[PDB]
Amino acid sequence: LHKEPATLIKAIDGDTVKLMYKGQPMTFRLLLVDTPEFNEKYGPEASAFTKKMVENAKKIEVEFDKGQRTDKYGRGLADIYADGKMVNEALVRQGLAKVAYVYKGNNTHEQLLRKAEAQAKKEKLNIWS
Ligand SMILES: Cc1cn([C@H]2C[C@H](OP(=O)(O)O)[C@@H](COP(=O)(O)O)O2)c(=O)[nH]c1=O
Ligand SMILES: [Ca+2]
């Protein structure tokens, strides 16, 4: 899998970010995770966590997986990195997202994310408390 360059346009919520990718604005939905909606418990924390992570980054990178690249809403589906750190993983490690929406073809980092979710669960972090 390849890391491609992109630049923050705007933080959206826990698992969606607007980025400029190949010179075009686009909404990215984070692969393999599900954060609570802003209106739900831990929703504001997950939005704040992703925000701080994408806004503090010197470098944002987008990585597509081996299946579908855009969903039925036209959102890009990707792993997002912030100065080398995967946002998808970091959210699950902190108990602010569940592993979810696992479809074959687009699950390269599945095991990694489950592994984070187990430690979060062990620590009773956030969603698991
Ligand atoms: C993460 C992800 C979501 N989706 C779609 C399925 C869901 O459809 P429905 O909207 O029909 O339920 C929706 C969930 O996104 P959200 O969690 O952002 O709402 O996005 C994909 O198709 N592939 C993906 O990899
Ligand atoms: Ca969500």
Curated annotation (Swiss-Prot):
Ca(2+) binds at D15, D34, T35. Coiled coil: none annotated. Residues 109-129 are annotated as: Disordered. Transmembrane segments: none annotated. It is found in: Secreted. The active site is at R29, E37, R75. Residues 109-125 have a biased composition (Basic and acidic residues). This is Nuclease A. It comes from Staphylococcus aureus. The gene is nuc.
